[PDB]
Write a protein that binds this ligand. Structure first.
Ligand SMILES: [Zn+2]
Length: 257
């Protein structure tokens, strides 16, 4: 099955998922000089104060922190978006080394990791319906660089010991995702896809310009997770990122000058 090894990694995915070679695949390199400021873009509205986190899961590709998405408790609106998008989960992609790990790049620069807050368009009623629509999902992407610790990340880091292997989960209530944001909400946006199979072309990407800083110790703990299940040969969960894909017939817009 698909993964991030030499034998089943991103360069192989097209055989099972031909949309991998589609017209709006993600991630992409963000060429900052080519993106254009769009004065018609609105500020992002990130309304997370009523978010209800539930659980943290190792799914064999990353770990997801899942939220109650049965009501409009944590929603993304504004920016390039038409309508209301509910937070369902967040997860990260990261590297084996601090100089790689992000999926998007900025003028070809790779960050140590990238956080994805995944939201679905409530007009489609459920996530499974939303992913079948060109405007079904909105993903907020945030780069991580290594420097000072991110205080609001530590609760996530500290629970990882308990979800080491694929299939493990733990309670993860009362977590506030506002603690994972940078100061500025300036962003780039473009139409794209899921970055894991099934690679569906259903995402409005909103990638924040300002990275968050996390400490070396925080990211080192991500790298102790396992892709494998319990009792199987250990394969460290590292380099779980898809490389940049061709931009094709797309323009990246900036919310800032
Ligand atoms: Zn992701």
């Amino acid at each position: 099955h698909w993964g991030y090894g030499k034998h089943n990694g991103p360069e192989h995915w097209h055989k099972d998922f031909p949309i991998a070679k589609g017209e709006r695949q993600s991630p992409v390199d963000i060429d900052t000089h080519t993106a254009k400021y769009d004065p018609s873009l609105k500020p992002l509205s990130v309304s997370y104060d009523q978010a209800t986190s539930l659980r943290i899961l190792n799914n064999g590709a990353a770990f997801n922190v899942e939220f109650d998405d049965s009501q409009d408790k944590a929603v993304l609106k504004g920016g390039p978006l038409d309508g209301t998008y509910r937070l369902i989960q967040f997860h990260f992609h990261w590297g084996s080394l601090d100089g790689q790990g992000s999926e998007h790049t900025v003028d070809k620069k790779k960050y140590a990791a990238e956080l994805h807050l995944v939201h679905w368009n409530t007009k489609y009623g459920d996530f499974g319906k939303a992913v079948q629509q060109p405007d079904g999902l909105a993903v907020l992407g945030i780069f991580l660089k290594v420097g000072s610790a991110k205080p609001g990340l530590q609760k996530v880091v500290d629970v990882l010991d308990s979800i080491k292997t694929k299939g493990k989960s733990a309670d993860f209530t009362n977590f506030d995702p506002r603690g994972l944001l940078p100061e500025s909400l300036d962003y780039w946006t473009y139409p794209g896809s899921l970055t894991t199979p099934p690679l569906l072309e259903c995402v409005t990407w909103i990638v924040l310009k300002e990275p968050i800083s996390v400490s070396s110790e925080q990211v080192l703990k991500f790298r102790k997770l396992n892709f494998n299940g319990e009792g199987e040969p250990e394969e460290l969960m590292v380099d779980n990122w898809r490389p940049a894909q061709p931009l094709k017939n797309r323009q990246i817009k900036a919310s800032f000058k």
